[PDB]
Amino acid sequence: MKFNPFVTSDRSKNRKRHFNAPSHIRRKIMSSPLSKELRQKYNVRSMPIRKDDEVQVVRGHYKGQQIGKVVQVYRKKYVIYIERVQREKANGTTVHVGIHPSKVVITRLKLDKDRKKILERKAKSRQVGKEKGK
Amino acid sequence: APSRNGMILKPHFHKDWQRRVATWFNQPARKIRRRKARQARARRIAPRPAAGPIRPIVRCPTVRYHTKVRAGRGFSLEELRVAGIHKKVARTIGISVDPRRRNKSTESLQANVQRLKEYRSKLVLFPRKPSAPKKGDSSAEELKLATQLTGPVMPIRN
Amino acid sequence: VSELAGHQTSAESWGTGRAVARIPRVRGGGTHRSGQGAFGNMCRGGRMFAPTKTWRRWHRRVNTTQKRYAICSALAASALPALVMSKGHRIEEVPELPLVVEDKVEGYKKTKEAVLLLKKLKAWNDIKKVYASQRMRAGKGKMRNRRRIQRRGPCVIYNEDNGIVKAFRNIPGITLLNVTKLNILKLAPGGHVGRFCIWTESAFRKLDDLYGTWRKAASLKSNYNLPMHKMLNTDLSRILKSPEIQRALRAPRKKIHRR
RNA sequence: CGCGACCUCAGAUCAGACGUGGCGACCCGCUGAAUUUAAGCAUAUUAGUCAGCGGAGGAAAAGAAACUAACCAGGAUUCCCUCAGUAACGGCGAGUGAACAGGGAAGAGCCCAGCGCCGAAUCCCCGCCCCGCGGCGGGGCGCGGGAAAUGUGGCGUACGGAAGACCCACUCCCCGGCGCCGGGGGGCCCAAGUCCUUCUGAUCGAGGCCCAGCCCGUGGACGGUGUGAGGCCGGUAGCGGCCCCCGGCGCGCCGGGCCCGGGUCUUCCCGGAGUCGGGUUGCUUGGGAAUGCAGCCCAAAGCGGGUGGUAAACUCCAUCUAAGGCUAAAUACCGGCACGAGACCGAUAGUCAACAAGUACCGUAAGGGAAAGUUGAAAAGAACUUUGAAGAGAGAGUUCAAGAGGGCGUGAAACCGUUAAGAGGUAAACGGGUGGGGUCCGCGCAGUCCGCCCGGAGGAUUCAACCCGGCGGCGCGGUCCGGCCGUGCCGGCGGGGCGGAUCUCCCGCUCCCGUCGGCGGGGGACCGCCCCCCGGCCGGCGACCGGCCGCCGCCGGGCGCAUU
RNA sequence: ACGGACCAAGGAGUCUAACACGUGCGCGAGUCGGGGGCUACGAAAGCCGCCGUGGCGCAAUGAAGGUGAAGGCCGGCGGCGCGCCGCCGGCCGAGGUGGGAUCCCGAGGCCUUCCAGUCCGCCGAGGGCGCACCACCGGCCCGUCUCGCCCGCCGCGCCGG
RNA sequence: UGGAAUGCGAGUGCCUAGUGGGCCACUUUUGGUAAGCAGAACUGGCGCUGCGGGAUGAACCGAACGCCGGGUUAAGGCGCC
RNA sequence: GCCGUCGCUGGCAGUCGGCAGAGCGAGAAAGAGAGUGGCGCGGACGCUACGCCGCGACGAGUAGGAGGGCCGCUGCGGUGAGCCUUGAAGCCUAGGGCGCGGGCCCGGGUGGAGCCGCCGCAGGUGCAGAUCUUGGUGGUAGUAGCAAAUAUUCAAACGAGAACUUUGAAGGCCGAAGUGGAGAAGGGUUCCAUGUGAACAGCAGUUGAACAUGGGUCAGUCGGUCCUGAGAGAUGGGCGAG
RNA sequence: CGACUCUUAGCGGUGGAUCACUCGGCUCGUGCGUCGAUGAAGAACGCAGCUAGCUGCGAGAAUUAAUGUGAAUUGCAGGUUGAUCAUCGACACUUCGAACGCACUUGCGGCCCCGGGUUCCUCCCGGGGCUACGCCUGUCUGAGCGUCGCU
Ligand SMILES: [Mg+2]
Ligand SMILES: [Mg+2]
Ligand SMILES: [Mg+2]
Ligand SMILES: [Mg+2]
Ligand SMILES: [Mg+2]
Ligand SMILES: [Mg+2]
Ligand SMILES: [Mg+2]
Ligand SMILES: [Mg+2]
Ligand SMILES: [Mg+2]
Ligand SMILES: [Mg+2]
Ligand SMILES: [Mg+2]
Ligand SMILES: [Mg+2]
Ligand SMILES: [Mg+2]
Ligand SMILES: [Mg+2]
Ligand SMILES: [Mg+2]
Ligand SMILES: [Mg+2]
Ligand SMILES: [Mg+2]
Ligand SMILES: [Mg+2]
Ligand SMILES: [Mg+2]
Ligand SMILES: [Mg+2]
Ligand SMILES: [Mg+2]
Ligand SMILES: [Mg+2]
Ligand SMILES: [Mg+2]
Ligand SMILES: [Mg+2]
Ligand SMILES: [Mg+2]
Ligand SMILES: [Mg+2]
Ligand SMILES: [Mg+2]
Ligand SMILES: [Mg+2]
Ligand SMILES: [Mg+2]
Ligand SMILES: [Mg+2]
Ligand SMILES: [Mg+2]
Ligand SMILES: [Mg+2]
Ligand SMILES: [Mg+2]
Ligand SMILES: [Mg+2]
Ligand SMILES: [Mg+2]
Ligand SMILES: [Mg+2]
Ligand SMILES: [Mg+2]
Ligand SMILES: [Mg+2]
Ligand SMILES: [Mg+2]
Ligand SMILES: [Mg+2]
Ligand SMILES: [Mg+2]
Ligand SMILES: [Mg+2]
Ligand SMILES: [Mg+2]
Ligand SMILES: [Mg+2]
Ligand SMILES: [Mg+2]
Ligand SMILES: [Mg+2]
Ligand SMILES: [Mg+2]
Ligand SMILES: [Mg+2]
Ligand SMILES: [Mg+2]
Ligand SMILES: [Mg+2]
Ligand SMILES: [Mg+2]
Ligand SMILES: [Mg+2]
Ligand SMILES: [Mg+2]
Ligand SMILES: [Mg+2]
Ligand SMILES: [Mg+2]
Ligand SMILES: [Mg+2]
Ligand SMILES: [Mg+2]
Ligand SMILES: [Mg+2]
Ligand SMILES: [Mg+2]
Ligand SMILES: [Mg+2]
Ligand SMILES: [Mg+2]
Ligand SMILES: [Mg+2]
Ligand SMILES: [Mg+2]
Ligand SMILES: [Mg+2]
Ligand SMILES: [Mg+2]
Ligand SMILES: [Mg+2]
Ligand SMILES: [Mg+2]
Ligand SMILES: [Mg+2]
Ligand SMILES: [Mg+2]
Ligand SMILES: [Mg+2]
Ligand SMILES: [Mg+2]
Ligand SMILES: [Mg+2]
Ligand SMILES: [Mg+2]
Ligand SMILES: [Mg+2]
Ligand SMILES: [Mg+2]
Ligand SMILES: [Mg+2]
């Protein structure tokens, strides 16, 4: 259960805070787990996805072991678009099929300074939690 | 139209009573609020009693109740003059003082003077400056052993 | 329901003639709601019959002796073997039904150690029954923050809190109760008597200090004795086939005489 | 007549400030009805209510007795329980209707005028210097300007106060700045399966994870993700972590104000006026020979005045100090901001308004005021061919599904169209009883089985009785040994916790001359109940048993051999 | 005679207070924490007794001042005409009649070959203690009316019983 | 020797809805020319009640009613319907 | 014969089994009662005692009252190791049925995501009517009607399509107090061009004041602006609780 | 067998009932409890590349700066020394409106200072700061056959 009297445990209020979230909270919600190799290497469970990330699709029709680059992260429909994950329209044009980032694993990260800062901060908090558990 | 047999009755609902209906659903929240305010006062005055200053042995008026003994408003000026405590020193050392009371009886006068003599002995007065104590202050062994008294200080038992 | 619901609209009745049904209708206008019908429980919109008030008598008080009798009955039915299974608890592998455990149960602070204690006490079948009976609620309660429902599990009564609540609250089904603060709503869920309880040694010894026997009064309470039995030998079968009664009886007329 | 003061009254786009209006749920002051009831109605009642008006605050108001009581007296205000539907009011009808006291939440007290003492000892503004300057403050320098004797400041206010004399004992309280050490707001993060098979359009479904009973759990709330997820994600829990901002408790320093108390004796002083009160009138109240308020008239006094719930005279008492003012707290909040929850409602319901809702629209105006949610998981929103001018189609295509095709989830009834069947001059329709025809159902169409016995054909590693081990039941074992319990009783050179309206070395307090009497408390003795040790009976183990022994039954393994 | 084309949805004895009666539960001459205080669900629950204040009930009556719910018998003494009243010591000490469910006593007998003969049951003539309740007769307290006689003193009376 | 016959289990206490417009019929009878008129007394029906008969029918005659089979009647009928 | 009600407060704990002896329908107050002297291991059902079983009589009903509902709707506490994308609710059904009945359960289709049984609890809990409220749809009914102010005809063009559009010719009307040309109030883009024929113009339209794109109002002299009229309305003053 | 009419069933239309969903109400409880002449509430009019309504904003006009966040907004085009979002503390906030120069026509003024015009020489144009009523303290100018003092 939850013991904080300010955290909402209401369905309609949680759906409101979800579907009416501003973009910096949209980025926080739209996060994806890392692979086993990257998780062992960085000690980081999950990260928010970026435009220049590599993705294996885990669930759905387009799942497999195909490492595809993200086309762009569309936070309005809570979705990302992947390069080879696409389909053909009636007229013939290719349209990228939208995949939610919860069914998405990262095989390679695109590392900038802020990205390395977030990874080091999450690894530091994980080490503090491990030392408190020890 | 009344039926066969029953009490005559006068319901006082001929006014517009439904506008002024005091619902009592604030009650456990107000119990929590009184509890938090009382604990806040107890944490505010740290050596002092959480109840407050002492209150006199008081006979009741109005012949239904005069066998019972209450806790009154404050000590009388003649009581403070016999006990030898100034009325402005008494409010500072935690003694309820009111100037309205009289002293017709001698026994209740002597009882409140004796209760002042007991409270002056039971009082642990802390110094103003801890580095430089004064003449009329408590001892250093009493400084550590002094603590709060839960409930009414010297509860008056009939 | 709010008192302004239905009374914000101004609606005078059309009177008689007009061949209308003599209802207060909305005073004019070039819209759909004009001469429509506002007041009354039967009209669209408007008010309903008997608006529910804030000053309904929601709360019911019970006498203290009846509350204590309910607590004593809910505890006494937790020792009989048939009444616990008739509540529904899987208790086939439990070694003793008044399950009293050592005072090291308050010392636990880990849910893994609590699960291991339940495995060693062999009461884990009830918790696994709770896991199997976690299902969806039927009806409109899902959109009123009552989404998931499950079975109540074995209660655990502790005397002091030294981490036993932190160790046992995360396992679904177990409700924790203090000895002095026993609750009727948790000792008898749903008004059905005989929920399986798990006592510690100090909690099992503190009951005689709380309620006492029939010759020793309550030590913690002000004035409370045990309730009185209406009959002591409740086994009426042994009373009926006893040599005292069966001597002074007549012959049984068991021959069926039809027309 | 001129000049110079004072007093009244002007003019300023004079220098510096303030008020106006809004919201108005709660609060204060007015004003203030009629519906209704009295089965009519006029007093009453609705009702100091609705509407109207003015004024603030985060609370407002009230508030430290011109009090309650008559007792062994209580002691500011506010709020709750109770007083109490009581005293009392009322065509004494209908109906209305407190207060004291007791139990609580809270608890905090005070300041002026007067009377008097002090060289106006007082206050505001402007010029200069230092500090600080986003709540314009502190100190110094000005023969700078005003206010004020038609009275500013200090002592001092009903609890007495002031002055003088005599004794007792301290020398630390507050304001404005600088630095230092150790709850609130914001931001970023912290556990564990997307593990192997199997369904599905998609899994969050199902099975398993054995010997660390998959891994975490101070985290199995909730929400999203292609149905249903503790372990996919945001989060959840945690005296969990990191970085800023703010206030407070303290320490050290600087600039200041302040030269401050108590007891005894002596001498003085002390109070609020068109105010109280009386008559009359109107409203109001439970207040009734007038509770409160207001208008008019009369109009005070000082061992005085007010109150003492029946008007008045006399007489003693009891109790306060009116006609000046301040003050948190507990108390109220259908307005606003930030929140949390629900035995509520689920798009004719719930707010009028789940949606471009006080919107569209109507009325000159004040005002009135709707209807209206759902493709799919993802637009994947139907390319292209073909008839038509197009609306419309027919193929083809997407999707699990178009029998989901842009007002599209599910698609009822009333009503309409088509097909199939049956029928038809007493309008149609109905009840009872049959007959005939259709729709499917009985997956019917050589017809249900179950025990015992007889006879003929077959097959097992098998029947009864004995041996060993284990388990269970019973035992009036007439009365085995040993534990446990008793809503059963006793005995004690036994030890204890409670209760009592059973009695009587130590400590504290006051009165009287180390002593004698009084009060309270603590031991101490007495009784009732309970707990723990024993010793002995009774009863039970059939809400509550252990070991052998005796009988019976069951199970497992040995044999026993085919007229079982 | 009135309402009524047809169909779908909505639609009308609810809630609070007071009282009466009946039933269920707890305690019982007591009962009740409703207001207050202490210790996710939990705004729940548990606790308080020197927080039972207070409500109701255990006592009624009168307008009020007020008053306020069995008696009998023996002995001694005083007064008056064996009988009455008043004052002290011991005993019996909580009404009666009828109808009254149930319980108690048990004249007798309840059978296997005749008599004698103990114990367990069982039925009953007839006689009793009589639950509740009913009808009546009595008795006690209070307000009021009538007739008369005595007792007590801190204050002898327009006193009190 | 429960002091006539016959029949039947009785007594008693609360709470209490609806009703408080009636109508018709053998007999008696008021007012009125009379009325399917107005107003009474006894009793029964309708109201509240279906069923067989009176062709029809709130009151007439018979007879009152759970669902059925066999039989038998009442009141009425037995030319046809 | 069957259903229900009432009564007998009738009967059933006696299923007392090699720890055994199987009964108390019988006209007759009460015991298949204890004593003491003269081979084969066997026996149907039962009894949710709020249940089971047997006898008799009874059965109308308005207003009204009471009881039983394993009749029905919604939500809550328990419970069913409940159901469910290998198909929940809702809906349809010439199917199989059950119950006196309220209603309920299966078979087939549609549907795509939740739902139900039992013990209790709670209510905004059951419709055929109220000239009921909202929404929708019929007969009427392809019916009444598209009848006030004299009147249209021919050819050609655009166009898929012409009685109504456009042009030409003919015949008419308003007949200068007009059916003409211009203003005030009011309307507010209705003015003009281009394109469309989805909706409107009660037939149609290639047309329009409709729709969609675009444009259009140029002032010292024309008005407002200035003045004052009937009047309105500040300041002083008065009144007023405001 | 016809047409028309009635009943039942399959299907297809009018219609949106039922069911299931719900970024919404209703009720209860907690904390805060703050508007305005330094110009409130409200109203009007404008602001987007394509923008009617809603939302947001004010000629700096779907936003400026600062901080935090750390690669987007998106319907279509266009272009890490910080895009977008949130906080918002700095800056700015058109016209009415208590509304304030007098009226409400967007009309008419008055004073002072700047730039074209000038060569302070008056108009004209443009920009900026003032000009509402009442009231408090002080200042200045005053009035009075009000009360006085001196010649
Ligand atoms: Mg947390
Ligand atoms: Mg009545
Ligand atoms: Mg207190
Ligand atoms: Mg409504
Ligand atoms: Mg449902
Ligand atoms: Mg000025
Ligand atoms: Mg104001
Ligand atoms: Mg009336
Ligand atoms: Mg009336
Ligand atoms: Mg009238
Ligand atoms: Mg009044
Ligand atoms: Mg008002
Ligand atoms: Mg304010
Ligand atoms: Mg105040
Ligand atoms: Mg008072
Ligand atoms: Mg009372
Ligand atoms: Mg009268
Ligand atoms: Mg009144
Ligand atoms: Mg009081
Ligand atoms: Mg002075
Ligand atoms: Mg005073
Ligand atoms: Mg989910
Ligand atoms: Mg699984
Ligand atoms: Mg989940
Ligand atoms: Mg799992
Ligand atoms: Mg996680
Ligand atoms: Mg986490
Ligand atoms: Mg008045
Ligand atoms: Mg009045
Ligand atoms: Mg007097
Ligand atoms: Mg005063
Ligand atoms: Mg005062
Ligand atoms: Mg809560
Ligand atoms: Mg709707
Ligand atoms: Mg709708
Ligand atoms: Mg709907
Ligand atoms: Mg609505
Ligand atoms: Mg729909
Ligand atoms: Mg489908
Ligand atoms: Mg569909
Ligand atoms: Mg769907
Ligand atoms: Mg559909
Ligand atoms: Mg008529
Ligand atoms: Mg009528
Ligand atoms: Mg009609
Ligand atoms: Mg309905
Ligand atoms: Mg009654
Ligand atoms: Mg009762
Ligand atoms: Mg009537
Ligand atoms: Mg009558
Ligand atoms: Mg008549
Ligand atoms: Mg009858
Ligand atoms: Mg009849
Ligand atoms: Mg005839
Ligand atoms: Mg006859
Ligand atoms: Mg027959
Ligand atoms: Mg005939
Ligand atoms: Mg019958
Ligand atoms: Mg009947
Ligand atoms: Mg049908
Ligand atoms: Mg769905
Ligand atoms: Mg409801
Ligand atoms: Mg209907
Ligand atoms: Mg035609
Ligand atoms: Mg026609
Ligand atoms: Mg013209
Ligand atoms: Mg023209
Ligand atoms: Mg045109
Ligand atoms: Mg047309
Ligand atoms: Mg005027
Ligand atoms: Mg729908
Ligand atoms: Mg709708
Ligand atoms: Mg625009
Ligand atoms: Mg910026
Ligand atoms: Mg930035
Ligand atoms: Mg003008």
Numbering used by the authors:
A (entry chain Y): 1 to 134
B (entry chain L): 2 to 159
C (entry chain C): 54 to 312
Show me the paper's own sentences about this structure.
XBP1u has two hydrophobic domains, HR1 and HR2, and a C-terminal AP of about 26 residues which pauses the translating ribosome when residing in the ribosomal exit tunnel. During this temporary pause in translation, HR2 is exposed outside the ribosome exit tunnel and can recruit the signal recognition particle (SRP). As a result, the paused XBP1u ribosome-nascent-chain mRNA complex (XBP1u-RNC) is targeted to the Sec61 protein-conducting channel on the ER membrane, where mRNA splicing by IRE1α is now possible. We show that the XBP1u AP makes extensive contacts with ribosomal tunnel components and forms a unique turn in close proximity to PTC in the ribosomal exit tunnel.
We structurally characterized the paused ribosomal complex (XBP1u-RNC) by cryo-EM and single particle analysis using a mutant version of XBP1u (S255A, full length numbering), which was shown previously to pause ribosomes more efficiently than wildtype XBP1u. The average resolutions of the paused complexes were 3.0 Å for the post state and 3.1 Å for the rotated hybrid state, respectively, with the ribosomal core reaching a resolution of 2.5 Å. The majority of the visible XBP1u nascent chain adopts an extended conformation, except in the proximity of the PTC where the AP forms a prominent turn in the tunnel. The turn is comprised of eight residues from W249 to W256, and involves the C-terminal half of the characterized XBP1u AP. Interestingly, residue 255 that has been mutated from Ser to Ala in the sequence used here is part of the turn: A255 is tightly packed in the structure and the larger Ser residue may be sterically more problematic, possibly explaining why the S255A mutation makes the XBP1u a stronger AP. The turn in the XBP1u AP makes several key interactions with the tunnel wall and is in part in close proximity to the PTC. It is framed by two tryptophan residues (W249 and W256) and protrudes into a hydrophobic crevice in the tunnel, causing the displacement of the base G3904. The positively charged side chain of Arg251 in XBP1u forms a stabilizing salt bridge with the phosphate of A4388, whereas Gly250 and Gln253 engage in hydrogen bonds with A3908 and U4555, respectively. In contrast to some bacterial APs, we observed U4531 (U2585) in the XBP1u-stalled RNC in its canonical upward conformation. Therefore, the premature positioning of C4398 (C2452) in the closed conformation due to its interaction with Leu259 in an unusual conformation provides a mechanistic explanation for PTC inactivation by inhibition of A-site tRNA accommodation: Leu259 would simply clash with the incoming Asn261 tRNA.
